[PDB]
């Protein structure tokens, strides 16, 4: 008689039956003549795996206390996806907390602009280039060329 079953199946009455696909919950056991019966998850609810659950799960709320907001509302196969506010980024890919974007200080400039999921990279302004302000947007400006200066100040011709 059967011991294990394959993926997306479960053993019941000495026989393999189908698990319910993502998006649906178990409602009635299979028989020897009929396969497992399932029902799509209702509004606000979801199930993201092949499963034998009789109830779906509630969509997570995006915690405002961590500067978090709904980005994509949850489907029946997918949880709520959160993100941060304008001007903040998620600490991780998984977006568990929100942090203000780094400003590149005087003598530095943005090598990379801040995204919504990662942070500003800064570079020290090399020879030939300068910056005099802290900004999460602004890059290193080049020196006025002398066909009519520091990592901070513009040269005077």
């Amino acid at each position: 008689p059967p011991t294990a079953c394959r993926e997306k199946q479960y053993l019941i009455n000495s026989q393999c039956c189908s698990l319910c696909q993502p998006g649906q919950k178990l409602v009635s056991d299979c028989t020897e003549f009929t396969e497992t019966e399932c029902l799509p998850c209702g509004e606000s609810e979801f199930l993201d795996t092949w499963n034998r659950e009789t109830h779906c799960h509630q969509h997570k709320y995006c915690d405002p206390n961590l500067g978090l907001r709904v980005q994509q509302k949850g489907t029946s196969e997918t949880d709520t996806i959160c993100t941060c506010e304008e001007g903040w980024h998620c600490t991780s890919e998984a977006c568990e907390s929100c942090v203000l974007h780094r400003s590149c200080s005087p003598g530095f400039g943005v090598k990379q602009i801040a995204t919504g999921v990662s942070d500003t990279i800064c570079e020290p302004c090399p020879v030939g280039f300068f910056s005099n302000v802290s900004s999460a947007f602004e890059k290193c400006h080049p020196w006025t060329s002398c066909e009519t200066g520091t990592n901070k100040t513009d040269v005077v011709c």
Partner: antibody, heavy 114, light 113 residues
Framework: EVQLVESGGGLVQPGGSLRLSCAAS????????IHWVRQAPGKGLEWVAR????????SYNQKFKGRFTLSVDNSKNTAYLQMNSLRAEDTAVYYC???????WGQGTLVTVSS | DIQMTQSPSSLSASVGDRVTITCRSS???????????LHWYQQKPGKAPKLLIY???NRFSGVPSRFSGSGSGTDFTLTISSLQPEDFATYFC?????????FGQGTKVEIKR
Amino acid sequence: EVQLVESGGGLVQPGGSLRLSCAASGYSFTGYYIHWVRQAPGKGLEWVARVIPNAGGTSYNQKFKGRFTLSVDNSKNTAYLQMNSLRAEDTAVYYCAREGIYWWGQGTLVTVSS
Amino acid sequence: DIQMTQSPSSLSASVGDRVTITCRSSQSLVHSNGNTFLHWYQQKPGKAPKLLIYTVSNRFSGVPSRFSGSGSGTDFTLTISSLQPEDFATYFCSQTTHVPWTFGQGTKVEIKR
């Protein structure tokens, strides 16, 4: 062998009720689902519902979840389809089938008209 | 709901000729226990459907040998090897792997003479 006799059909008016019966023999009644299927004149079969008499489940087509009710009397190895708020497009031959059994009986014609 | 897509809709063929009908399932009709619950019926006007083939290919007791079912998964064929006059009917397939049970749109076969 396993035998299922449909019974109860006839002429009823729009908004009327009607309970059909499926009297079953030749198998262990409580261990298998009885399904109801119907066939409107000129059209294909349409699955209605099923019930298993271990009192351990009933399944209804979305279309009929309000109005129809399956039901069972173990003492008489019989299953019942109760149809309510009948409409003219419920006019059909109502058949009756045990899971595992792929042949059809004669059914019982239900007509719904003024 | 599993959609069964049956074709052709109508055909006409001479006595003795091979007749082929297709059913397709929108997804696999194979149960996890291995059985594939697809079935073929013949239905004559005013009569109940007569079982021809059960579980894809098993010809039902009493059914003539000219009726035979083949296929697997989502792809099935009913063959009448040698059409006969008495074979005028609407033929149609059935899936019972899942509830709701669903059915092909049928094929009306007619003898040409």
